[PDB]
Structure formats: C-alpha cells, structure tokens
Design a protein around this ligand. Structure first.
Ligand SMILES: *[C@@H]1O[C@H](CO)[C@@H](O[C@@H]2O[C@H](CO)[C@@H](O)[C@H](O)[C@H]2NC(C)=O)[C@H](O)[C@H]1NC(C)=O
Lengths: 48, 27
C-alpha cells in the first residue's frame, strides 16, 4: 500500500520514484482514453 | 495544449510558453 500510494507503478518495475497522487491519477486517466484536464478540473468532485 | 482558465486547477504556476511562429512574423 505505501509503495502504490507514494510511487504508483514505478516500484513494481524498479526503484520507487515519488510522484504526487493527484498527478498519478492523471496518468491513469490517460490509460483509459481520457485527457488530463478532465481530472484536474474535477479533482474535488472525483476525490469526494 | 490549452483547456480552460487559470482558476479551476490547483497548483498551476506562472511561466512562459514560447511561440515558434512569432519570430517568423518579423520577416
Ligand atoms: C501567475 O500570474 C498571474 C498574473 O496575472 C498572477 O495573478 C495575479 O496575482 C496577483 C498577486 O496575488 C494578484 O494581485 C492579481 O489579482 C492576480 N491576477 C491578475 C489578473 O493580476 C498569479 O498570481 C500568478 N500565479 C502564481 C502562482 O503566482
């Protein structure tokens, strides 16, 4: 849990590299075909 | 790419985005 929160997927394929969680969530939105600005404009709505 | 204003995003910062076409406008 600590790795997948502070490092995303990087720790599973090498050294753990820190990255902020709201920014990590933007990466994962890109994986399903959604642009980054969608998350940043609804961060308070998504988090709730 | 551009999307929206500078108010709904938390953590946005000042900076400059360089325009390649502007230097070509002079000539
Ligand atoms: C990015 O630059 C803008 C320039 O408009 C800054 O916005 C102004 O910031 C000052 C300082 O707090 C305010 O008095 C103004 O009301 C703001 N708006 C305008 C239109 O002047 C903004 O603060 C800068 N971003 C950061 C993170 O410093």
């Amino acid at each position: 849990l600590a790795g997948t929160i502070t490092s995303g997927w990087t720790f599973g394929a090498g050294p753990a590299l820190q990255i902020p969680f709201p920014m990590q969530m933007a990466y994962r939105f890109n994986g399903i075909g959604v642009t980054q600005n969608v998350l940043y404009e609804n961060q308070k709505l998504i988090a709730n | 790419f551009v999307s929206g204003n500078c108010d709904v995003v938390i953590g946005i910062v000042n900076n400059t985005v360089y325009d390649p076409l502007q230097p070509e406008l002079d000539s």
